[PDB]
Design a protein around this nucleic acid. Sequence first.
RNA 1: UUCACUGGGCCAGCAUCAGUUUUGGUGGCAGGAUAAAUCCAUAGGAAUGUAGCUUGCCUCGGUAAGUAUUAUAGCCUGUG
RNA 2: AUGGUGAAACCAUCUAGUACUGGUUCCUGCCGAAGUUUCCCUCAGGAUAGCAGAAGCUCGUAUCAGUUUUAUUAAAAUGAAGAGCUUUUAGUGGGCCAUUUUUGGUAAGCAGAACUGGCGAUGCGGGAUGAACCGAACGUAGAGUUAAGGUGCCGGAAUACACGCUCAUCAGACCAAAAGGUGUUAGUUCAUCUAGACAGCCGGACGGUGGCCAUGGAAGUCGGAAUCCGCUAAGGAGUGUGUAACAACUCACCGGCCGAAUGAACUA
RNA 3: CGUGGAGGUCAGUGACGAAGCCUAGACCGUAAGGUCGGGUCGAACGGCCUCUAGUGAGAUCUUGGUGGUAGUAGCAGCGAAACCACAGCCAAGGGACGGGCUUGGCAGAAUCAGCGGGG
RNA 4: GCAGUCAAGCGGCGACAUUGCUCAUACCGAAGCAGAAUUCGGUAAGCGUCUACUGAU
RNA 5: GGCAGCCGCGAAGCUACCAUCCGCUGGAUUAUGGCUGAACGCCUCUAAGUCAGAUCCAUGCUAGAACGCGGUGAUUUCUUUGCUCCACACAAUAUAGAUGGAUACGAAUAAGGCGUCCUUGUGGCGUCGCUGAACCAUAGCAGGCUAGCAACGGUGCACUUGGCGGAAAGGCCUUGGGUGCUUGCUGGCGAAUUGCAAUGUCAUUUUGCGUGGGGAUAAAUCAUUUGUAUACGACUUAGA
Lengths: 197, 330
Amino acid sequence: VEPVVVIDGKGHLVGRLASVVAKQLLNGQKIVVVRAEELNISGEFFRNKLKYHDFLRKATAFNKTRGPFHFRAPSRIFYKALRGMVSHKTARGKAALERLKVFEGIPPPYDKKKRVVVPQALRVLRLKPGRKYTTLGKLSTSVGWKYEDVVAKLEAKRKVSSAEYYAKKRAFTKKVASANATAAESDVAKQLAALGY
Amino acid sequence: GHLGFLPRKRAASIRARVKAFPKDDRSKPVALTSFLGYKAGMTTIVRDLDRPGSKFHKREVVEAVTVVDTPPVVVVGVVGYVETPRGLRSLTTVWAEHLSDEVKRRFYKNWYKSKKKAFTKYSAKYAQDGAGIERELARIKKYASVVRVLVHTQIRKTPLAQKKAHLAEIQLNGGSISEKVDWAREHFEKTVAVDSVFEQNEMIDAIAVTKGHGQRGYHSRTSINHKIYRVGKGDDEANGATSFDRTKKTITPMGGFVHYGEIKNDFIMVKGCIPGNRKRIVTLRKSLYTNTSRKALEEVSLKWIDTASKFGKGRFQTPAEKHAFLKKDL
RNA sequence: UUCACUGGGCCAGCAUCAGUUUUGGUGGCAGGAUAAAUCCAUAGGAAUGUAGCUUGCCUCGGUAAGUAUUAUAGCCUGUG
RNA sequence: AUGGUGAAACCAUCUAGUACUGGUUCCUGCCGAAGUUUCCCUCAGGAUAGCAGAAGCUCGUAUCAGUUUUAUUAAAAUGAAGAGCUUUUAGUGGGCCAUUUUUGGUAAGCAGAACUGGCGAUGCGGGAUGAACCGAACGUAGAGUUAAGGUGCCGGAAUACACGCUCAUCAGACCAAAAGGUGUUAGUUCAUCUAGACAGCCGGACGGUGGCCAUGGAAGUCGGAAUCCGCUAAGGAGUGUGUAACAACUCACCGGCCGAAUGAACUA
RNA sequence: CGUGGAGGUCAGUGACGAAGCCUAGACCGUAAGGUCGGGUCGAACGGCCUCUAGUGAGAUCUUGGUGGUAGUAGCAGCGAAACCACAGCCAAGGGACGGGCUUGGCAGAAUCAGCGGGG
RNA sequence: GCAGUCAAGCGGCGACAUUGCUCAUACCGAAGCAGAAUUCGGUAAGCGUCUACUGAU
RNA sequence: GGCAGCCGCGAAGCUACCAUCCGCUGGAUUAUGGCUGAACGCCUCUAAGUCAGAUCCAUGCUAGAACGCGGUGAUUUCUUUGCUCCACACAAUAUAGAUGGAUACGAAUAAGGCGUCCUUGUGGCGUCGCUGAACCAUAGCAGGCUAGCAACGGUGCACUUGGCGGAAAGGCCUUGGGUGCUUGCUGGCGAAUUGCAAUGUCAUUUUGCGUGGGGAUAAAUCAUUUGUAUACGACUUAGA
């Protein structure tokens, strides 16, 4: 329905978000993920942090370079989870992965475009109340990520100047509502209500 | 072997680039953080050790001290950088419109065969009140967070056949970045001296490429914690004299240095042996942090510096003293 | 020998048919404790006590403790 | 072996001699096993019985059946013309796994006698791959429903519904475990309870008596046997703290203020 | 189904082109194979009923020929041999064989010298 | 190992109790650890008596 | 010393625990000690919260993606005008796949959005969610040729003022007038024979040949030579 879907990873589960996005990728739908650094994983910090180290151990017994290497960026962590859910090493899998983009925060021009969320992957709607959860930001920093401060610092600048845009939009909508409200009850407006509009 | 340096492959280039600079100081006055020079052989010094609690306290001590040729440095431009999620990125760079022939040679390999059509359209950009130049500088002030200066050594002032100026970036420090870029504005085409960036007893570290051995040598090294003893104005006289000797001498030994010419510009005396053989370029940095120790804080009351010929066994520190030594002449 | 119809070859469209098969709409019937309920009645009963009344009572007459089986709400049980 | 060759073994025939390693050449259809029972004792080898074919004869069926029940083998149900007699004739003697009767046994495992099933000659789907696991016994095709497996992606199918259950610092999806855990959840048997259940504070917490003995001293509380008695509201010659010994605090035992369910052991 | 030859038969085909060979041309039969078109070619060959047999990918198979090894070793110019099913990266599962199977990660097109690590 | 009493319980069997012979380093917690030195327990397991690699295009 | 030898000093070169210099400073923390406080009206370092405190990550150093990335200067003529920017003229190569619009706050989810008020605050009042089944847009030959009405708004295109956006800004907005449409409203004509449908061809990235109008108009390698290099390669110097 949307040529390019932008998904906000904040408050989502990596496994649920990755699985949902993975199927869409195989279906030809292009998807972009933003604010990956704010993505969350179930369980308290120790379990998530401990499991990441265990995976790092089995990289390669003899030579890490002649094998896999560990990406510290939160986006790569999500990409690794999504990569395992796609038939990599194949033309269909490789082509599907090319339709996916992941960035920390909301780099432009996506900042000026609407972003959606997946209702069936939100932590609020999936995790039991009162249970502990882990955030990729702390996990990524604990494993050597050196850009958490930069992302947080410039993300506030993203948060700023957006409320101003909404503030102008909110005032503009107020004028539209007043213009629409006064125009209501007219002959055309009254007839429209009959047809449900 | 030490896995910290392996694999022991080739160095990136003859010049070594400083990978890290002093962190930041947004309150101190704007000043440079590094310098460039050449390995001007080595010499020996004798001084009284004022270190308390030492086995040789107040006693004379001999130590080999290296001398680095550091001719004045002129700024050709400035570089602006902006923080990004993927690391620092170079936003924009500007030039002084009058890059010296030595700098212009740095951009050409067959300099003689080339037409020598160096910066020309950018040079014409200065044909007005600076609207184009200022606007590019303005965005750096508006957007850039850390500013690095583009400077080159006055190779023409060194006894080197190269004449190809070495060009590298130096990171600035200080608050109110608007002042930092403004500081670079004044220094366009101007020269800077080591005395404005270093001082006696200050702790610094030097980075260079080690001597080759025709798989050995030719690797970058960053031996840290080297102490500066004397920063002499080589252009002035009595650079090799001392307060308690007060005899006019020159640091240059009789017959010069091995594989190096005379010294006729600013120089720095550094404790230890900076990596790299003679004729090798060395970049100077100040400790990467505010090191605080008795060894670093101790001052040096320099007594006498050896300036005898190294092409054999020396006897005198100057030809005038050689008068107390002739058929071939008279 | 000239077209000007058909036969002749490729792919399909529509109408109604016969076999297999999938998924909806709707109607008429026999059984249940001749479904059980609900509902309409009828005689009783207490309580997570309705109305009414009485013991302190600030919160302006408010409640928390009584008495009270329907009363200015209702419920359950027994039978038609 | 025969007949010759050269002197600091070879040549030609009997001889293509005498047998376990290897190979054994075009297509399709049908049928199609065995893997062991009888003496010569077994290592040696056939002759016979069987599995599968071919003709004839008799008979289509009271001819029977890897089927269900009396009786002391009639007969009643189901299924079928596939029933019987010779005559002769390729290949076949490995067995593995599981089940059962089961004797033997010491760290152990299991060994071993026999019986019945799967494989052994075997494709298909699932079991992430996999002897012997689950279903399913195959001509080439189109249509629909299923077996076992699954329905977050790889992976075709519901991030379906309902009820509970768990925080695990590699959980969970893969027998050394009898017991431990102030982990969690639902129950079983008993004790008390508006005469006031639990807990929290306060008071009482006594007389013989400093009970008898060792002895500088054991006054309840370093030690040895009794552990008696009166009133009490309940109080142990005293459960601990505590002193050189006293003293002092406390519980167990009741009482006063509070206000309902609480406590003890077990099962899952 | 196909081949060597034989009896009969088609008063068969054939220098205006029979045999053999090639065909990213076509047709027939599930198959052994058969037929047609084009190129080459130069003197014999085929349809059918029967007869006949020295009649149809591997045996460290025989003969003859041709590749990598290799323009390498070796003595500018000349110029081999051994060997060669095929490739020859890791953790785990592959029941007893991991070098081909499975779960994940890998891999430079191309080229080349040393420590010798194995051989 | 052999032999024997008793029993929390399991339903006649039986756990443990039961009788005879046969680190040198560093950081924490306890130790009559006055100090020094020291043992014990835990933590770090630190610390000691054709192809792998590498030069080059 | 012409010939083949040794001796005293003696560089350079080979070249060493056989000599000199150097070898860092912040977090998450475990064990452990505690604060607060239930589980259970006491208690408790723990279940909800939290401080100190060694293993891990950071600081620093080494290497730097044959197919990681950013900034900067230059970028070939009369080579029969080579190179490149712009408008279209025709062709080609293909489309991991348009067939109306990726419609922009943030924060919480045991709470928040929109309007209003004054007591500008964790304040009062009104009201919304329970999905986007939304909002915008949508009529005209694949969207024509023309006449009026009412507004002077809406909007395509080229000029033009000003501002914002450096994370991958490469885009986002505003003053001014110019020129078309305006289906906001009412009228005058064409649709055909694509014969009962054939996606019935209406966009996207790249390139060449052509014109017409603009701009700049160079370097590397080989060679000589050199050593701070060098097994051989390779790499670093200097020149009209």
